[PDB]
């Protein structure tokens, strides 16, 4: 799949507003998906004892692995699609070390979708949730590529 260069402008121009704050996006993404998807929070042994929002709020590790992750991200949205070298050690590490099922790549890009769509209304409207939504599906989908590659189903 291909996005025009309007998808990526709309994706890009919201982007702009998120590393306006990094570190608080961050947070609320990962505090979303804890919350929504439990079962992901037994993948990270760093942060598997957090038992509440409150205490992964005030995790000073989590925010800056928060910030780590959307740095990663925002690099990969930035190549506007060329970033097959980004994605070769991003593949490597979550399919060999972190063993991180497709899966749980929809639950994080549900995530994002959410957070941007309570904090960004004004720019991610309809059609800036569908150019989102196509730029995390061509992620998830050359990940998916790599993992087969790398010999990881998941
Ligand atoms: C938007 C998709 C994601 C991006 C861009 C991303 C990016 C990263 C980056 C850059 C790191 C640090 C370097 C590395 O280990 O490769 C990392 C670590 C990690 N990621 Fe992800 N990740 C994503 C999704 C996920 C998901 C959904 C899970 C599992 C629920 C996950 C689990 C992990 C784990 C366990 C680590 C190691 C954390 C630590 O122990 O320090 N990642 N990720």
Redesign the pocket.
Known sequence: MVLSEGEWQLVLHVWAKVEADVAGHGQDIFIRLFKSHPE?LE????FKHLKTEAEMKASEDLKK?GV??LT??GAILKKKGHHEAELK??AQ??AT??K?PIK??E??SEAIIHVLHSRHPGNFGADAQGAMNKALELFRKDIAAKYKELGYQG
Do not use: C, G, Q
Request: charged residues 20%; proline residues 5%.
């Open positions: 992901t993948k990270f042994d760093r692995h780590t992750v990663a991200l050690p991003l590490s979550h070390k972190h991180i749980y790549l639950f994080i």
